[PDB]
């Protein structure tokens, strides 16, 4: 589970 | 309904934390065939990301239980886990296919500016990536080719049109690096992209205002966190 | 489906945070007409409380926007907020009616022990209370009478059959006090019930194990917190 | 918004 772009 | 009413109801659904409703309202707004403002683009993204995010989380939980039960969990398993994982999977594929349909029927072609084009091509890569997380067989190969092609077009445009600290350009590169590592099994390419993206943006951080810096470093930190996990 | 498969799928849905699915699985399990274990009772409650809780939160957000727009928000308002509040309201009423149907068709009558009977009568009071939060006219009066009658029967049984620190007895009294304050507009009765419940349970806390104490005081603290707000 | 019984 890599980190992807957050959603705001 | 009129477009303005659909947008109003999307914003209400957002405040009410009703993300399925929010996505349906924004779908109807998109289908009017006019461009989205930055605000509206973000409403669309927030809505569908919340919906698919819950489905992804559910799918991962179920798939993990299913594997640990195909690992000699014998007699501790009827078909229930597999059946329920398949159900959630079909629902997730439907939502991803709906978003991709909006992107290919309206949003990408109709976008009048490069930043919007990058935003939507990144979204196209992302929802193909989510499909790839659950795909098998020939479907998986097609999906992976489509994700790569969307991400690459977005990357080309962003390098031409956006500064290296632009948060959209950074988030695109971050997500393409995740695609390399997790989906394409190209960890060399993933680590290379994440490090190069970080380095080329670092180089500019000293020119940034307080507010610009916060946006950019939020994404750069995630590049750093992935490099930790991946190295 | 067999009951055991429905329970298994409810537990999977719980791990997957799929509470609508979880509730539907437990509904099917209840409709087999056999009693629920304590575990299963809690699956049922968790599932429907999550579903109605999201609807309640949404309804409160929307209703508040609607009132602040009926407060001279003139020309900042078409029918969108009202229409969407009504939609969420109808959906909430449906879920509450479904739970109440399970309680009246199966759970209360079939319960073979007093603790289960109290648990289900408390649930009956709670879901009538949620209906009362949105009700108007004659519906509201009927609903409030039904909530009071269920809570009162539960209270009578719990005073006969459960010690004053029992967490179920405490949570029942807490929720009946909220009914008095918020629904019946009987704040004298609410404050009286909350204080008496706290005092009679305090009196026993010195006999309780570490684990019993934690359960009981969790609820007693909420009684204290409400008394703060209400006094 | 009073506090009601938590759900575990
Ligand atoms: S229309 C609102 C203003 N326009 C914007 O583009 C956003 C700037 C940054 N932002 C964000 O939430 C973060 C920090 C997550 O940056 C993003 C990175 C990648 C994408 Cl696709 C989107 C945002 C808020 C508004
Ligand atoms: S079948 C599982 C064991 N039985 C129980 O009754 C529960 C004991 C306490 N508990 C709780 O979550 C809290 C502390 C919230 O107490 C309750 C108060 C009121 C109700 Cl209706 C339910 C629980 C866990 C299991």
Numbering used by the authors:
A (entry chain P), D (entry chain P): 124 to 131
B (entry chain A), C (entry chain A): 1 to 231
Pull text from the paper:
14-3-3 is ubiquitously expressed in mammals and plays multiple roles within the cell, including phosphorylation protection, conformational changes, subcellular trafficking, and induction or disruption of other PPIs.13,27−29 14-3-3 typically binds to a phosphorylated serine/threonine in intrinsically disordered regions of its clients. Of the 7 isoforms found in mammalian cells, 14-3-3σ is the only one that harbors a cysteine residue proximal to the client binding groove, providing an additional degree of isoform specificity. The disulfide tethering screen targeted C38, a native cysteine on 14-3-3σ located proximal to the natural product binding pocket within the phosphopeptide recognition groove. We explored the scope of disulfide tethering for the discovery of selective PPI stabilizers (molecular glues) using the hub protein 14-3-3σ.
In the initial screen, compound 1 was identified as top hit for ERα, C-RAF, and USP8. In the protein titrations, 1 increased peptide affinity for 14-3-3σ by 81-fold in the C-RAF complex, 19-fold for 14-3-3σ/ERα, and 4-fold for 14-3-3σ/USP8. Crystal structures for compound 1 were obtained by cocrystallizing with ERα, C-RAF, or USP8 bound to 14-3-3σ, with clear density for both 1 and the peptides. In the presence of the USP8 peptide, the phenyl ring of 1 was turned, thereby shifting the fragment up and back into the 14-3-3σ pocket. This conformational change seemed necessary because the USP8 peptide allowed for less space. While the +1 Ser of USP8 did not show any specific interaction with 1, its +4 Ile pushed the fragment toward 14-3-3σ, which was not an ideal position for this fragment as was reflected by the weak electron density and the minimal stabilization for USP8. Lastly, USP8 and SOS1 were the hardest to target, likely due to the proximity of the peptide C-terminus to C38 of 14-3-3σ, which was also reflected in the small scaffold of the discovered stabilizers from the primary screen.
